[PDB]
């Protein structure tokens, strides 16, 4: 718990980070640091993107690196890291 | 491709692709089991393909790696000695990567097939010839193990048993060369196989033609090849032209040409003059285009050497095999007298042909009993540096000078 | 015929033509007989 | 003129670049010099994932401009972006 939380706080220790959220497909985040309605809504949105990306991967190659898939867009480098038990979605910056 | 180009050749699309590519480029810019490089990567006899429906009572005839895809082995079998009812002779294949012992196309041949090789010019098929006067083509596309088409076994084609054949010309313009025991140089049209595209009754030394038992051509020099002889008169076979044929009767042995390939190692020093040869007289010598006599030799084993076809990267290594059942890979830059990589097969059985892979990554070996054994040939000896290629060429020149010096010493030191 | 015959080349050509035709017919008949035997076995083993 | 080919060479011969397709906005790759079906399937998968990313963005805020989607997979982790005008493919490994 505290190990994963410290790892998240270290990866998001970069200044200006939009938000690093340990997430879930259930529409709520495992560990987020944003506004609660926005965090739950973005958790559901990332759940939808995660299901679509999982189907896309299984269509392309069903044995790929299916534990993380970032979105390094200019707005937020959305580092989705869906684990096997939990999940993560880190809307991060393009710098660090 | 017009729509693909127009999607590519849109100005906005091109600018967006340039910006995204530059941004992405700037953003994104056991060991002991691996410890057999100099002690096993050059010789790792692994793939023992032996189809008992074919391997038993049969020998190995020749071998090659397919240029279209080197993951397989395009090799034939010799005359099945004890199969009066069964097929006379066919071709097996063991994939290098995939572990499938069955050949993807067991082209069973009615006669005894002489030799064969794959062809990437029309990569759907394989080609070969017979030990009774036929050359046939079979394809992995078809579903018949018999020959898809046959060259006309008449005066036009190789009447005698033609043991060597090669598809002269790449996919640009292919004309399957055939050389007969009766010396019928026959560049055959790979598409129209009714009659060969060329019918040249090759001969040398005042039309007293020799038995061309080992055909070889320089890499890319489609106008000149090299033909071995049973009488040893390996004369440089010009391939293109009116007077094309075996001209310079360089004699660098004392027996029939066992197996000879053009020593076409590639690097800084272009050794296209040299050509590795093997004799029936246990005389593995280095004949060359300039060196009318054998430049340097090797006569270690008592029995006759099987064949010689060095790898196409390092001029130092002379890939061959001993008649007493052992490999023979002598690296010239490593040693000049003793055979360097004289690996020994299990049971010391003889072979009649062997070949490095088309990439040089593995040097397989045949068997008299038919057990096709493939030995990996890694970068310990086959990785030629440009300096190492140049070093081997300079060592060859120094050895030529030393041979001239030793000949002079013998000439001036013979007590007469 | 005989080896001393002056039409030895045409006789060899005719023998070759006959051999090639027989081989092609044998191969085609083998394929067709495999198809027919498969059809008969399927009819015998089919559902009602 | 040669900018498109230069971009294809840049994003196809970058640091471990899988290959670059100057594809149209339909998603599927334009220049496929082999069996095109794998390129079209993977590109349709990536277009579905990009639409999912757009849906997640609109869930957060639809007026966000995107640079790329940093897809991570064992076949070809694509840092590409399917667009409404074209599709520029850049699949490379940031650690390689």
Curated annotation (Swiss-Prot), chains A, D:
Keyword Membrane recorded: no
Any one Gene Ontology BP term: microtubule-based movement
One term under GO cellular component: cytoplasm
Keyword Acetylation recorded: yes
GO MF, one annotated term: microtubule motor activity
SS bonds (residue pairs): none
Compartments it resides in: Cytoplasm, Cytoskeleton
Tissues expressing the protein: High expression in heart, liver, brain and pancreas; moderate in placenta, skeletal muscle and kidney; low in lung, prostate, testis, small intestine and colon. Isoform 1 expression is up-regulated in 64% hepatocellular carcinoma (HCC) patients.
Primary location class: cytoplasm
Pfam family for this entry, one: Robl_LC7
Entry-linked Gene3D superfamilies: Dynein light chain 2a, cytoplasmic
UniProt keyword list: Acetylation, Cytoplasm, Cytoskeleton, Dynein, Microtubule, Motor protein, Transport
Modified residues (N-acetylalanine): 2
Role noted for this protein: Acts as one of several non-catalytic accessory components of the cytoplasmic dynein 1 complex that are thought to be involved in linking dynein to cargos and to adapter proteins that regulate dynein function. Cytoplasmic dynein 1 acts as a motor for the intracellular retrograde motility of vesicles and organelles along microtubules.
Known partners and oligomeric status: Homodimer. The cytoplasmic dynein 1 complex consists of two catalytic heavy chains (HCs) and a number of non-catalytic subunits presented by intermediate chains (ICs), light intermediate chains (LICs) and light chains (LCs); the composition seems to vary in respect to the IC, LIC and LC composition. The heavy chain homodimer serves as a scaffold for the probable homodimeric assembly of the respective non-catalytic subunits. The ICs and LICs bind directly to the HC dimer and the LCs assemble on the IC dimer. Interacts with DYNLRB2. Interacts with DYNC1I1 and DYNC1I2.
Family, similarity comment: Belongs to the GAMAD family.
PANTHER family (UniProt xref): DYNEIN LIGHT CHAIN ROADBLOCK
Descriptive protein name: Dynein light chain roadblock-type 1
From Swiss-Prot, chain B:
Compartments (UniProt record): Cytoplasm, Cytoskeleton; Cytoplasm
Record PTM text: Pyrophosphorylation by 5-diphosphoinositol pentakisphosphate (5-IP7) promotes interaction with DCTN1. Serine pyrophosphorylation is achieved by Mg(2+)-dependent, but enzyme independent transfer of a beta-phosphate from a inositol pyrophosphate to a pre-phosphorylated serine residue.
Domain of life, per lineage: Eukaryota
GO cellular component: centrosome; cytoplasm; cytoplasmic dynein complex; cytosol; dynein complex; microtubule; vesicle
UniProt WD repeat ranges: 55-104, 108-148, 157-198, 207-247, 252-297, 300-340, 346-385
UniProt keyword annotation of Metal-binding present: no
GO MF entries: dynein heavy chain binding; dynein light chain binding; microtubule motor activity
Coarse class of the protein's main subcellular location: cytoplasm
Keyword line: Acetylation, Cytoplasm, Cytoskeleton, Disease variant, Dynein, Host-virus interaction, Intellectual disability, Microtubule, Motor protein, Phosphoprotein, Repeat, Transport, WD repeat
Example GO biological process: microtubule-based movement
Coiled-coil residue windows: none
Subunit organization: Homodimer. The cytoplasmic dynein 1 complex consists of two catalytic heavy chains (HCs) and a number of non-catalytic subunits presented by intermediate chains (ICs), light intermediate chains (LICs) and light chains (LCs); the composition seems to vary in respect to the IC, LIC and LC composition. The heavy chain homodimer serves as a scaffold for the probable homodimeric assembly of the respective non-catalytic subunits. The ICs and LICs bind directly to the HC dimer and the LCs assemble on the IC dimer. Interacts with DYNLT3. Interacts with DYNLT1. (Microbial infection) Interacts with human adenovirus 5 hexon protein; this interaction probably allows virus intracellular transport.
Family: Belongs to the dynein intermediate chain family.
Official protein name in the record: Cytoplasmic dynein 1 intermediate chain 2
Swiss-Prot record, chain C:
The protein's assembly and partners: Homodimer. The cytoplasmic dynein 1 complex consists of two catalytic heavy chains (HCs) and a number of non-catalytic subunits presented by intermediate chains (ICs), light intermediate chains (LICs) and light chains (LCs); the composition seems to vary in respect to the IC, LIC and LC composition. The heavy chain homodimer serves as a scaffold for the probable homodimeric assembly of the respective non-catalytic subunits. The ICs and LICs bind directly to the HC dimer and dynein LCs assemble on the IC dimer. Interacts with DYNC1LI1; DYNC1LI1 and DYNC1LI2 bind mutually exclusive to DYNC1H1.
Entry protein name: Cytoplasmic dynein 1 heavy chain 1
Gene from which this protein is expressed: DYNC1H1
Pathology linked to this chain's protein: Charcot-Marie-Tooth disease, axonal, type 2O: An axonal form of Charcot-Marie-Tooth disease, a disorder of the peripheral nervous system, characterized by progressive weakness and atrophy, initially of the peroneal muscles and later of the distal muscles of the arms. Charcot-Marie-Tooth disease is classified in two main groups on the basis of electrophysiologic properties and histopathology: primary peripheral demyelinating neuropathies (designated CMT1 when they are dominantly inherited) and primary peripheral axonal neuropathies (CMT2).
Role this protein plays: Cytoplasmic dynein 1 acts as a motor for the intracellular retrograde motility of vesicles and organelles along microtubules. Dynein has ATPase activity; the force-producing power stroke is thought to occur on release of ADP. Plays a role in mitotic spindle assembly and metaphase plate congression.
Family: Belongs to the dynein heavy chain family.
Source organism superkingdom: Eukaryota
Membrane-spanning ranges: none
């Amino acid at each position: 718990m505290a190990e994963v939380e410290e790892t998240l706080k270290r990866l998001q220790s970069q200044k200006g980070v939009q938000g690093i959220i340990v997430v879930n497909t259930e529409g709520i985040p495992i560990k987020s640091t944003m506004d609660n309605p926005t965090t739950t809504q973005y958790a559901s949105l990332m759940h939808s993107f995660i299901l679509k990306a999982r189907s896309t991967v299984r269509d392309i190659d069903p044995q790929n690196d299916l534990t993380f898939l970032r979105i390094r867009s200019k707005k937020n480098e959305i580092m989705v890291a869906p684990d096997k038990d939990y999940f993560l979605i880190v809307i991060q910056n393009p710098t660090e | 491709e017009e729509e693909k180009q127009q999607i590519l050749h849109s100005e906005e699309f091109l600018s967006f692709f340039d910006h995204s590519t530059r941004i992405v480029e700037r953003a994104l810019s056991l060991e002991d089991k691996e410890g057999e490089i100099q002690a096993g990567a050059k010789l790792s006899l692994n793939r023992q393909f032996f189809d008992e429906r074919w391997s038993k009572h049969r020998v190995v005839s020749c071998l090659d790696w397919s240029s279209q895809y080197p993951e397989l082995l395009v090799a034939s079998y010799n005359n099945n000695e004890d199969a009066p009812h069964e097929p006379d002779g066919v071709a097996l294949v063991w994939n290098m990567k995939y572990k499938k012992t069955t050949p993807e196309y067991v082209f069973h041949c009615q006669s005894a097939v002489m030799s064969a090789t794959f062809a990437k010019f029309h990569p759907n098929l394989v080609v070969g010839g017979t030990y009774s006067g036929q050359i046939v083509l079979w394809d992995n596309r078809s579903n018949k193990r018999t020959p898809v088409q046959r060259t006309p076994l008449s005066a036009a084609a190789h009447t005698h048993p033609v043991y060597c054949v090669n598809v002269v010309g790449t996919q640009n313009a292919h004309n399957l060369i055939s050389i007969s025991t009766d010396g019928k140089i026959c560049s055959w049209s790979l598409d129209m196989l009714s009659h060969p595209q060329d019918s040249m009754e090759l001969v040398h030394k005042q039309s007293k033609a020799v038995a061309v038992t080992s055909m070889s051509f320089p890499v890319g020099d489609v106008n000149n090849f090299v033909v071995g002889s049973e009488e040893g008169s390996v004369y440089t076979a010009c391939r293109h032209g009116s007077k094309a044929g075996i001209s310079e009767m360089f004699e660098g042995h004392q027996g029939p040409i066992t197996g000879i390939h053009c020593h076409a190692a590639v690097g800084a020093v272009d050794f296209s003059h040299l050509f590795v040869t093997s004799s029936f007289d246990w005389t593995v010598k280095l004949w060359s285009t300039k060196n009318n006599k054998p430049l340097y030799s090797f006569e270690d084993n008592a029995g006759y050497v099987y064949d010689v076809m060095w790898s196409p990267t390092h001029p130092a290594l002379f890939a061959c095999v001993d008649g007493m059942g052992r490999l023979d890979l002598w690296n010239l830059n490593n040693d000049t007298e003793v055979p360097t990589a004289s690996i020994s097969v299990e049971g010391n059985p003889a072979l009649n042909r062997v070949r490095w892979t088309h990439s040089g990554r593995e040097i397989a070996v045949g068997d008299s009993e038919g057990q096709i054994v493939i030995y990996d040939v890694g970068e310990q000896i086959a990785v030629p540096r440009n300096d190492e290629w140049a070093r081997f060429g300079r060592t060859l020149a120094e050895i030529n000078a030393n041979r001239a010096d030793a000949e002079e010493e013998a000439a001036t030191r013979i007590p007469a | 015929l005989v080896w001393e015959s002056y039409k030895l080349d045409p006789y060899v050509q005719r023998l070759a033509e006959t051999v090639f035709n027989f081989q092609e017919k044998v191969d085609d008949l083998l394929i067709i007989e495999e198809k027919i035997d498969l059809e008969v076995r399927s009819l015998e083993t089919c559902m009602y």
